[PDB]
Write a protein that binds this ligand. Structure first.
Ligand SMILES: O[C@@H]1[C@@H](O)[C@H](O[C@@H]2CO[C@@H](O)[C@H](O)[C@H]2O)OC[C@H]1O
Ligand SMILES: O[C@@H]1[C@@H](O)[C@H](O[C@@H]2CO[C@@H](O)[C@H](O)[C@H]2O)OC[C@H]1O
Ligand SMILES: O[C@@H]1[C@@H](O)[C@H](O[C@@H]2CO[C@@H](O)[C@H](O)[C@H]2O)OC[C@H]1O
Ligand code: CA
Ligand code: CA
Ligand code: CA
Lengths: 533, 533, 533
């Protein structure tokens, strides 16, 4: 009844939460602002965005954060009449260290004003709050080992959280070291039948990703490993369209059914290439999928081998679909930008992004380059399909090559492409292509830039994505289009192409304005179109 | 009279200001907080630190700033009853862009409470404020060109600044493109005779560095170039112990004499090595020197040819020397940290660095690792000599390998070495060595670390610097010192060694505490000693 | 009167030899076969190729030699009624070692069958045979030090050679260590007035290259260095069209005049670039220039300062001009290949390259690819001008992608471009472009290759080089020519571009046939043209 993935495009580390017959999934958002995206469902098939909880500087201040830093795996839970959301702001993403900070916020409702943060600890990412049967509370996260000779995933640490004291109490204790996969992270605790079950992710979030499960009658263990571990993995199944299956969380429904949600990468078509040499490139980044579970000797079993199935059988409820929460052609009609739009690291005030300066237009005042981890006037949405068209219509008069405005396909500060309006000494105002690949810049139309006539109020910019390749086009009138003669490869905006390993997001497409001169020049965007093909 | 360098260790981009018979030099401080150092002198020979102007988050907020970002070359001038300070906060320091913002702050007195910044522009670094005879004021700076087919140093832009509107007005114009040396930056304007003189730095701040001067009778040029340009340079003088001479400023003394201050690097000793192949390694970074000028046919000339002289004739005024402004041995009985101490990027409040918690001690609560561009509990002072000892006494009780405290010699987040106390599963509380070289970490004393006796309150940590090499040693009593069996090389803590080439600072020595578990564990430093040998 | 360079394109390490009023210059040929080129002149201005001495496998066997190995600096002298030629076959060109063996061969005549080699030593490249007034003979070369903590240019070794025993005798002894420039190599000995003069190259063969001279009254030293040393250098003359001035040999004329020949690199036009940042790219490799000397206090001085002159006054002799020694349009009617043509490493027999199989054609039977250091059916001549056209007309019927024939511009196995005929599964016989940069291959006409009509017998292939760029073109009928829309960059075929720094040759243009299948397929080339402008 359900076809994976359920959440498409950048949607990793799903954290499922049941409130009655209501289902929530919280995913990680990394450098993209605001922090955490929460989807609500009635049937687990159809998903709707209902919260974006970390929207105040007091809660999440990400300026300067590295690419793929920020909000890693979040944990959503419900207890004592309120939602508990745990999250990390990760500061260092490369080297011996992984500096980052674990915080708790709460709210009586899903889409309310969530509290200011309570500081937990810093010992490692993956934080999860356990609500025990006796009313005591426990935080589990991974424990980080920076030392030269050592594997960094020291195992799972656990420490009591005092609600009243608003702090962890007692001494932290390692309760589990993982199996021989290692890279043990993403711990979740569950009290089921007579056991504590400890769910982890192991093998790392590339092609060796697994969900491991263990159990103990004592919270502190020692835990004993599933006899047929891993619970879920893609590593044995190179032909499965769903790779990387791991970082799971478990739901017990109101219909006495069991499911497992997990991230998964969907590689691009690599027909005619070696099966096991390189398992692929995922521009849609890590998406959220859902597996059916079943129990056998006090152990859950993913229905249909420990590999992910494409289509499963859902829970015994009536289907509930949702109205489309965005315009295919978004004319900038509201007084708030559509909630699929995110900014990099920080909220953009009306001094930078505003619907109030020119009616029915998003206006962007130019800030820093596409390479800045600080202040970019950039509003973007996820690539959410392999085949799509996206388009925009923009008014812009640059007086210098320090100014630009354009349509950008973007991975991170060092990996992106763009069709942009700029200015040139001889040619005046022009259109041009620009790419950045691991910080190396190319201008494919250098010497042959497109002269924009003076009488043109609006330049129309379009990208057409067709799985492995995409192309840009322009129009001066809305009617007559022209392809720019350059084919781009989507694999270059994918998790798997990034040489750092710190590549935890996915491709975005959006609207950018840069003013390197500091003259507060701006571009008026009449609309932004995103349409699946 | 005057031996160079006048400001030793890290003191780049000297901007010199005359007020009557008082003399001030401002130098750049990059990622080090607080922003900008100002020194005073009566005779151009003896110099004391009198101001650290950019000490409010509102003036300078460098959280996340890259290494060698932040405060680049500043400009100090005096006019209309007050001091004017111009500065850049540089956000991007690698690739095609150099995103960064120029700001003006003022004060009636050199060590007053300077204004909050007035925003000027963002078009390039090296901003300078010119006050013309007719009362009018003008900003000059370099203009950045990001384009792939282009040299980035597009020339010198000039624009009128309206004190009344508190903004640049009219239209920006390029007034100078440079000479074939290119890398034209650091513009300063001078009205002399019936001429505007434009001074620039050219050829880049490494071994081809130079200072170039031009003249015009129109503020907007064309400027004719000095007939024997460069005005100053070490490039053709590979044996001059003073290298990289350039980024200069001119001072016309009250006694009708002319001088020129500039940065320089002093390479480590190089015998046995090709004179020209690699011209050296500068652990003291770029330092400040002074040269006499003399005039011919409407042109200035560095007395003693166009290379820098080691020793010069001071101005015709009485010698005025200054009492020492730090203690060789700092016992931490002050109410504030000695002004030769600095922190990374941000101010540290009493929650991180405190002289109050335990009188006679500096307490550092553990924050992030030595590789973090965010929050480090780290207090440090410049290497200002080739030959030195530096030493500290600390009590620390780490309970996990995630915590540490030590003596660090530091270039940047990826380049440092430390003798630190930490914790190990079997040995308990230990002394270890740790190094980071372009992010790659080494533990040279593994697994052969010093065991600290449970009964020892303070560990005594020392480093002895001898030009090319340095050594770490320790005592449990202050009297019986044992060397650690590793010889270190000072060239690895120099501008010239860093692969990125955003390397514009110099070596520091200081005190660090890390707590990556998040338990607020601290270290108490009873004293810090630094002594020239 | 004499305009430099006198030998144009790849002509390094000139060894000049006088015999009455006959003048000879031998240069290095590295991996190009046959080994060594000797040019003759009566006037030092006009030069004609007269000998290629190392043309037998017994003399020079270079199969598998690495790029820029094989025949390094040669030495040509005349004594006791015959010619003496010292050479090196360098086997190792990267790492701590420079494995290579020095050899002596002799001939009564410049252009006869030279003798078989007498092995000499192996201690360092740059061998030179000196002939003392008292009829004794000594060998000088450089001494090679492979050790980690050591500069590899240990200085100059000297040793006597015995004509009767056919070998070196007595003890080897260091006579010279070098100046602070180091990289001491290319030693030559002269006996003049009271002194022996020892000339060397220092600073390395890039932009720091120098000629260094020293004197002693004793053959074994010690040697006092010239007081205004270097004798010759371009290093302080960044504006000089002739760069890398070094590796000289001295000639005393029959007119009692003195000159110095030297190598030199002429960078491509550099307008807009920083003067000193990178001093240039030389696709014509290292060329041979000549300078005039005068004497003063027992020391020779380069007339015109110690930098090289573009134009000099030649010796007071009658001009002797030489007729052009190749056809602009080589129709391949001759019995042997023009002597400007070389092969890689080895000679090619009639089973690979023949003018005999097809009258009026050069036939190449396809062997191994362009990346092979073993057997290539490749016949090539030097780039000798910054603007030229080269062109060929070829008949070729490939039956597999494994077979190619074409026109190649070639630096080494890992750096080259080509316009070539091959075969395609669906399109059949096609014309394509291929490039290789540091072993990375591109096909810029991927998917748009030119279909060759089956009815066409000859494909005409042309390259037009214009200084910084060049462009390929083709025709089927030889009147109407189509440019392939790809603009190539000459700097990618230059010494300076090559990453290994074992880059000692220069760019060639030639004809190539590959048969990767082993079917002995061949290409018939009707002509080869080369023309300046
Ligand atoms: O927050 C999530 C984490 O679960 C994941 O953790 C690891 C980071 O370091 C790398 O060594 C591993 O590949 C990876 O599993 O980071 C990704 C994020 O989604
Ligand atoms: O403030 C000074 C700058 O003026 C200087 O700017 C240049 C930045 O680009 C680099 O490629 C060059 O090396 C450098 O000249 O850098 C140093 C800083 O102190
Ligand atoms: O015959 C010449 C050599 O003597 C010379 O070799 C040196 C080899 O190492 C490089 O680092 C130096 O720059 C170079 O001088 O050049 C090669 C050959 O032409
Ligand atoms: Ca609209
Ligand atoms: Ca004290
Ligand atoms: Ca012919």
């Amino acid at each position: 009844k359900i076809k994976n993935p359920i959440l498409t495009g950048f949607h990793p580390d799903p954290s499922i939460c049941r409130v009655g017959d209501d289902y929530y999934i919280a995913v990680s958002t990394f450098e993209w602002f605001p922090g955490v995206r929460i989807y609500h469902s009635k049937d687990l098939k159809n998903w709707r965005l209902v919260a974006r909880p970390l929207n105040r500087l007091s809660q999440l201040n990400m300026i300067g954060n590295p690419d793929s830093g920020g909000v890693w795996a979040p944990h959503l839970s419900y207890s004592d009449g309120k939602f508990w959301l745990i999250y990390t702001d990760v500061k260092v993403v490369e080297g011996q260290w992984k500096d980052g900070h674990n915080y708790l916020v709460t709210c009586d409702t899903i889409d309310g004003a969530w509290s200011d943060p309570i500081y937990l600890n810093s010992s490692g990412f993956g934080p999860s709050l356990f609500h025990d049967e006796d009313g005591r509370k426990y935080l589990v996260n991974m424990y980080w080992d920076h030392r030269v000779d050592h594997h960094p995933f020291y195992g799972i640490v656990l420490q009591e959280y005092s609600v009243e004291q608003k702090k962890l109490v007692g001494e932290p204790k390692i309760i589990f070291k993982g199996t021989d996969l290692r890279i043990t992270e993403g711990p979740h605790l569950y009290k089921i039948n007579g056991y504590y079950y400890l769910l982890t992710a192991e093998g790392g979030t590339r092609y060796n990703h697994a969900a491991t499960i263990a159990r103990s009658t004592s919270l502190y263990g020692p835990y004993e490993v599933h006899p047929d571990n891993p619970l879920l993995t893609s590593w044995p199944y190179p032909r499965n369209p769903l790779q990387k299956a791991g970082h799971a969380s478990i739901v017990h429904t109101h219909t006495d059914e069991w499911f497992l949600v997990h991230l998964t990468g969907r590689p691009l078509p690599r027909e005619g290439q070696p099966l096991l040499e390189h398992r692929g490139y995922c521009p849609l980044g890590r998406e959220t999928a859902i597996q059916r579970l079943e129990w056998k000797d006090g152990w859950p079993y993913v229905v249909g081998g420990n590999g992910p199935s494409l289509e499963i059988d859902g829970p015994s409820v009536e289907e509930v679909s949702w109205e489309k929460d965005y315009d295919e052609k978004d004319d900038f009609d509201g007084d708030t930008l559509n909630h699929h739009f995110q900014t990099l690291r920080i909220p953009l005030g009306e001094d930078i992004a505003t619907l109030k300066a020119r009616p029915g237009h998003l206006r962007l005042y130019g800030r820093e380059s596409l390479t800045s981890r600080f202040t970019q006037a950039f509003v973007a949405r996820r690539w959410q399909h392999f085949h799509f068209v996206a388009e925009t219509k923009v008014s812009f008069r640059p007086t210098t090559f320090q100014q630009s405005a354009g349509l950008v396909n973007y991975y991170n500060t060092q990996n992106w492409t763009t069709l942009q309006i700029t200015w040139h000494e001889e040619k005046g105002r022009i259109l041009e292509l620009m790419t950045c690949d691991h910080l190396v810049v190319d201008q494919p139309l250098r010497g042959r830039e497109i002269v924009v006539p003076d009488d043109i109020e609006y330049v129309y910019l379009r990208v057409t994505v067709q799985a492995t390749t995409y192309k840009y086009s322009y129009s001066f009138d809305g009617m007559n289009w022209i392809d720019l003669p350059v084919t781009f490869e989507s694999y270059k905006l994918s998790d798997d192409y990034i040489k750092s390993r710190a590549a935890f997001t996915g491709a975005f497409v959006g609207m950018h304005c840069r003013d390197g001169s500091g003259q507060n020049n701006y571009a008026d965007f009449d609309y932004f179109l995103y349409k699946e093909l």
